[PDB]
Design an enzyme around this catalytic site. Structure first.
Site, short mmCIF file in Angstrom:
data_model
loop_
_atom_site.label_atom_id
_atom_site.label_comp_id
_atom_site.label_asym_id
_atom_site.label_seq_id
_atom_site.Cartn_x
_atom_site.Cartn_y
_atom_site.Cartn_z
N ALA A 1 0.81 -1.21 0.00
CA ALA A 1 0.00 0.00 0.00
C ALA A 1 0.85 1.27 0.00
O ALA A 1 1.65 1.50 0.91
CB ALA A 1 -0.94 0.01 1.20
N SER A 2 0.65 2.09 -1.03
CA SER A 2 1.37 3.35 -1.17
C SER A 2 0.85 4.35 -0.15
O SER A 2 -0.36 4.63 -0.09
CB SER A 2 1.22 3.89 -2.59
N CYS A 3 1.75 4.88 0.67
CA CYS A 3 1.39 5.88 1.67
C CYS A 3 2.00 7.23 1.32
O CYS A 3 2.88 7.34 0.46
CB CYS A 3 1.82 5.45 3.07
SG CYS A 3 0.82 4.13 3.77
N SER A 4 1.54 8.26 2.01
CA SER A 4 2.00 9.62 1.74
C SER A 4 3.47 9.77 2.13
O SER A 4 3.89 9.34 3.20
CB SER A 4 1.14 10.62 2.53
OG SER A 4 1.74 11.89 2.63
#
Ligand code: NI
Ligand code: NI
Ligand code: NI
Ligand code: NI
Ligand code: NI
Ligand code: NI
Ligand code: NI
Ligand code: NI
Ligand code: NI
Ligand code: NI
Ligand code: NI
EC number: 4.4.1.37
Lengths: 249, 253, 243, 240, 250, 240
Positions: free
Chosen positions: F156-159
């Site tokens: 999951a790509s996070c900020s």
């Protein structure tokens, strides 16, 4: 010879029984039996029973139950209490036989009560007979190839991909099983699996835990030695050890 | 008081006994008593006794005899059979004491036979009875002179002592649980296993004996270096009689 | 007998020889012979000779000369032409014999020229005199008498001829020797003092003690790149370990 | 550019070639085309061919044959004698080319004889997946949509790669390389190469697995020595 | 000049001073100075002084006291508050000078009180604070090099001395970072714990809430078994993040 | 309670909403909503919006756009600029909040302009229909598998704001620095990683189960992250 012949043999057997109770584990074999029973006899003429006992984890029980519901079966759990048996509680080499006997006896009581003509399990061509359980896949001469083939024909893609064993295998022959030491090993293997080691056994030697892991993971594993040591000590083992032979020495 | 204080009490006590038998281990303390016995009484009035038993390696015995020879003492080995005592054979918690009792009993018998006035050991500073020393009349003159470990190192090299045993051995009984029965075969089993682990490059090691399980304690800093030997150690300790060969995740201590 | 006897035997042999030339490599054994030669006969009656050649590293030669000076010897370097002998150049199984012969021949001439009665080396138990072995010294006895004499400095890792890095029959050259020596010198600089880079043409086969291979994984890529720039096409770790 | 778009492209492509022969390796790609050929054209109009040769393992052939039968296709084994070709047996740098020539020549003959319109392979001879602009994300999606779960997950290279150019391939050194890689895979390393250097075996492993591997050093050495190598080595460069 | 010449020069110098105070660290140089002082002047005319401070480990101090007692010297500890001097507390490139200034000043006071004619240190041939205090370097006056020191140590039968050239903890802080008694305590407790696991050569570099552990690269493999305990332990010492430097030791 | 119950409530909520806007990030959860939007509302009544920003990777966008197109949705990208807000530019502990408002403010116009009845996002246990229908992570994986979804962003790509200390000013230079370091570590086989930014110190977080496998790469990571501008490159002993 062809799969179409063997599937036809199995459709005919189910139509003759008219109404069945299915011993359901979540594996591909019992998944195929249950899916064919449903497609041939309908939901209301099939009861899938999942066995809950002290020798298997609640996790495998919840997963087997949810798999049966996902296929669209009426699923019923039954609780067995294997330690009522002296041969299982003292873990004699004959324990397996008495465990199967107690298992198949309960399914005949269930099958008798719901009007089924037979209990079905998932065994294939490579105490079941004492209780009269039917192995339709083995009667229709399915091999593991034929199960995967007919599972693919039916669009089955989800099943328990690793079939488990009973926690009795973690105790030497003759050792008395208790509700506590069973909980001890199962908590210990669940904790190891939570660190990312899905294939693991915590073998029980009274005050010693002897951990079997696949050798290829032992290098990745040293980062956890101390937490594993302390965690299994709090579970009641006085020593936590890694077996140099690896998984199933 | 000062170091000159403690040598004088210790010289005086030695001069009074005239002829002594010295329980000699090779450690800094027994080296110190024995060198003071020789420097004050001469070779002909001192006997150094080194104990041989199965609970220690043949290697450690050979080394303790040579150090005594290098100090210029007449040295006598004596071999015991600690497993003749039920408290030792059955490895009870007091087993250390009953072991010392059998040892001090043999040295008193040696000392009586050579005409010494006392048995000396190198002791400085919970049991079933009398102190095994007081039961035998053995004297610990370093302790009577109130020696500290600083005084032992200090007066030893005022005497020019250079070689001794920096690693104190530990009876092989420690590898067995309390209540487990020791045998000549299982002792041989543990000892062959530790000698083999040591030959792979691990000098500090324990093979704890748990019946059909060997539980290896290593310093944790060496466990990474060790995996290259897992398979060989497993098969080798199996040929020595263990059914399972295991590494303790807690480490050595 | 006792260690005091074997020391006495060794003192007697040295007094009888009166003047000696000592084949000095820098290891614990030749260190002990040389110091005891000095302690019995004095500086002016002892000559330490360190051999420099293409089959041994310049580093061990430098360390042996300074060690001999630090023990208090008059030390003399000598340079041998091991590759002038065809059996050594073509690395035949008897190459060690002609190498040993050439070594002791050079040391016998030094000793004849300086009036020594014998050439001493450091061989122990288990036409040059090995006084330690005549006195029945074992490696345990050597460590004992070294500590009793207060010796602390010597080369702890035994040197062996670079010939062992080449197969029998392979012709040794100044280039392949230099590359094997550059490769092991780089391995030693990373913290692996006993190592072998065995030469199999375009393949380097690294032997390390197995107990160090886990410590070694952090260096795989740098070692691979450096030995490639030294001329090997593939750089490999031998799964059997050292010897 | 949806998946249903390209499956319509692919079935439409298959509809044209009413009879097909599928070069079947057991990988995800040939398994997808083979089930798709059967489901669009029927069993009697599809022939799956599995190549038996000395440059690929007996295991991959047995697995490709059982999987193809498990998909419900009529399956044909064919055995290629790659080392009868001098160009392949002495392993020149051009050998890959002569190998593919012998292979596709064998499948064109099978296809002509069984009345097929084309030979199909699994590329991403016609590569219908690649003509339909399938990616491996697209292949996994549609394999699951048909309920495919079983295929060979380790795609074999030809064993020629383990030999230096100019080295002569024999039935003995091939057997040796293949035995060594089968053993390495059984310890838990599916991606592995045992490069052949006469008396030296040079094992390539992904660097990310070399740490996991140290526990096997001694067994790998004894086992590869018993297969005929005198030295067994690990390449510090890793796999490729 | 021969080693016998240089040892004789040094015997002559010591005989002249009669009574000496020796700055003793445990290294080979001061160990040789201290043993020669005892061999020439006797136990009653030599006082070994070992400095204790917050900038050095208790382990290095205790070992120097035992080395001196084992050589047969009367040994005395002295405790220096290096952070009382701002030139040291502000961690500048010249802070080592002011440390030496405070050190040799204390050694002159000890020597004055016990009647010694000089303070001796272990400096050899190849500094300013040494001369400004009138401390003498008899090894350097006799032209000893490190080769001359090892030779006479072996002729004297010295075999035990401290091999880690112990460095002040200021090196674990960047220049300009102000040292405090608390952050020093933090760095040194952290290194004491790391050394207790079997890692004698280690540095805990201080970057505020970040600890940057330097280990020799050849030991990093051995270290993985300790990651979790080192992380939690250094956090309880006050670091919020605990890290291993991939570059290794410097 | 049962999985069939939770799917039925979720289809019922979608039928009631008639037309929806789905904030599409590429994760399993938003992937699950978006295909379910298509199955109940059809291609012409669902709008997928994938947000492009400076705080997220260019790689995560292409995968979100490729997944949506693959899934067969009408997909529209929209480009935002989170760093225009002063509370995020200095990364106050309140950054996530001013960032969240700006995201949902732009997504409401899509729906509003689109005529959609609601904006849907993927949160589990704006309307979060998965959480309203009581989906857990086991229920999402189960119904994703039952629907034949096989492709999603498994990490999951996070900020990128998460890699900076509170109070540290975000720049286009240090963001790229952090993003380049993680792309390089993932190319070595570490898909789950964080490169934490402490000015001259890079602090690498990895899952502890991979740290042993990681030692073979210490030197290459150190030199590489040094050339990206870090003075020291460090591994965090607590892990990811
Ligand atoms: Ni019960
Ligand atoms: Ni019975
Ligand atoms: Ni007996
Ligand atoms: Ni000849
Ligand atoms: Ni190590
Ligand atoms: Ni042939
Ligand atoms: Ni041709
Ligand atoms: Ni203060
Ligand atoms: Ni000033
Ligand atoms: Ni504000
Ligand atoms: Ni791993």
């Amino acid at each position: 010879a062809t799969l179409a012949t063997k599937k036809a043999t199995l459709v005919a057997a189910l139509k003759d029984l008219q109404r069945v109770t299915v011993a359901f584990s979540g594996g591909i074999d019992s998944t195929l039996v249950l899916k064919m029973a449903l497609d041939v006899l309908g939901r209301d003429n099939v009861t899938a029973v999942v066995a809950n006992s002290e020798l298997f984890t609640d996790e495998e029980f919840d997963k087997a139950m949810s798999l049966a519901e996902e296929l669209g079966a009426n699923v019923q759990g039954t609780t067995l209490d294997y330690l009522s048996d002296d041969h299982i509680k003292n873990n004699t080499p004959d324990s397996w036989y008495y465990a199967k006997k107690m298992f198949y006896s309960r399914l005949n009581d269930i099958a008798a009560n719901n009007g089924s003509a037979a209990v079905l399990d998932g065994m294939i061509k490579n105490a079941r007979s004492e209780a009269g359980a039917r192995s339709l896949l083995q009667e229709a001469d399915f091999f593991k190839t034929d199960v995967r083939a007919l599972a693919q024909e039916l669009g089955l893609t989800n099943w328990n991909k690793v079939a488990s064993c009973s926690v009795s295998s973690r105790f030497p022959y003759g050792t008395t099983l208790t509700h506590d030491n069973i909980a001890q090993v199962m908590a210990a293997e669940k904790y190891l699996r939570s660190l990312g080691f899905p294939t693991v056994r915590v073998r029980f030697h009274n005050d010693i835990a002897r951990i079997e892991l696949p050798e290829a993971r032992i290098g990745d594993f040293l980062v956890f030695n101390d937490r594993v040591n302390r965690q299994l000590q709090s579970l009641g083992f006085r020593y936590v050890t890694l077996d140099l032979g690896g998984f199933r020495s």
